[PDB]
Amino acid sequence: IIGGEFTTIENQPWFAAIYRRHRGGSVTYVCGGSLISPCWVISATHCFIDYPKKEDYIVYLGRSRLNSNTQGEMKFEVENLILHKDYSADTLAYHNDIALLKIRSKEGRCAQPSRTIQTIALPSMYNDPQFGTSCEITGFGKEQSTDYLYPEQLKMTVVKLISHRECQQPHYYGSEVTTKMLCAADPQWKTDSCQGDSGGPLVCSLQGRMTLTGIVSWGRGCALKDKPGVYTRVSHFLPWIRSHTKE
Amino acid sequence: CPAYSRYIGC
């Protein structure tokens, strides 16, 4: 997260922290995600495409720090890792960048809401809010494009949805932003998601409800003039989602 | 790895 503020899990209690264990025993952070029902976390397919064995993954909920423990956090295994069949990584962008993880604790439970863990509602199919609406993003991603390290504390910031027409402008992204994606950026280009915020939530208030409107997918640089963050347009994937969530 | 990925792995 470029700019924005350090925060704690309580202000984003749907936020999931996804890690991978390597051959040694060493565990490193992979991507963000979002709790959309007690047993289900939603993220981005590109997070997993290189190492698709579900066994290697761990999901934390209730977690406000990257490499240390938070009071109230809960650790989960991944019982099903569902990548999107039409996923693809182009030369600049990703397509159908959406993934689902069914989480199970070693003791067989799905997540239990607490002060630090809550679900985030999905939108209605094809229902997205107005362009210029202010939304929230969250993650453990870099605080600057050029950084080598990641912040230890969770951050969040606010960005505004951008029109497709604006988005498809050549000095923006031109052709590469499709209707299954959303753009969002800072009006002065000072705040953004960055490397390591991938898979994370874009949350917007729709009707009166806080809703998961996007999933962090790609952007050129971070907080870079005329290059918005790009997100997977969740409202377009309710059939894909509901098919797998009904088990 | 697309040129504009925001993935840790890229």
Residues A106 and A180 in one domain: no
Do A140 and A151 meet the contact criterion of CB atoms below 8 Å apart?
yes
| DSSP letter for each residue of A195-244 | TT-TT-EEEEEETTEEEEEEEEEE-SSSSBTTB-EEEEEGGGGHHHHHHH
**What would the 3-class secondary structure string for A25-53 be?**
CCEEEEEEEEEEECCEEEECHHHCCCCCC
Planar angle of CA A96, B5, A126, nearest 5 degrees: 30
| Dihedral angle computed from the Cα positions of residues A25, A26, A29 and A31, in that order, rounded to the nearest 10 degrees | -40
Residues A99 and A172 in one domain: no
Residues A81 and A104 in one domain: yes
Residues A202 and A244 in one domain: no
Distance from the A18 Cα atom to the nearest Cα atom in chain B, whole angstroms: 12
Residues A5 and A28 in one domain: no
**Interatomic CA distance for residues A227 and A64, integer angstroms:** 29
**Interatomic CA distance for residues A215 and A225, integer angstroms:** 21
Q: Which domain does A211 fall in, by range?
A: 1-12+120-235
Residues A86 and A41 in one domain: yes
Do B9 and B1 meet the contact criterion of CB atoms below 8 Å apart?
yes
Helix (H) or strand (E) holding A155: strand A155-162
Distance from the B2 Cα atom to the nearest Cα atom in chain A, whole angstroms: 5
Residues A106 and A47 in one domain: yes
Residues A127 and A228 in one domain: yes
Residue of A nearest to B1 (CA): A89
Q: How many domains does chain A have?
A: 2
Helix (H) or strand (E) holding A88: strand A88-89
Reduced to 3 states (helix: H, G, I; strand: E, B; else coil), residue A165 is helix
Residues A26 and A102 in one domain: yes
Domain of residue A43, CATH code: 2.40.10.10
Do A215 and A36 meet the contact criterion of CB atoms below 8 Å apart?
no
Burial A9-19 (b: 16+ CB within 10 A, else e): beebbbbbbbb
Rounded to the nearest angstrom, the gap between the alpha carbon of residue A133 and the centroid of all alpha carbons in its chain is 18
> Which experimental technique did the depositors report for determining this structure?
X-ray
Interchain contact, A194 vs B6, CB within 8 Å: yes
Rounded to the nearest angstrom, the gap between the alpha carbon of residue A4 and the centroid of all alpha carbons in its chain is 16
Residues A242 and A155 in one domain: no
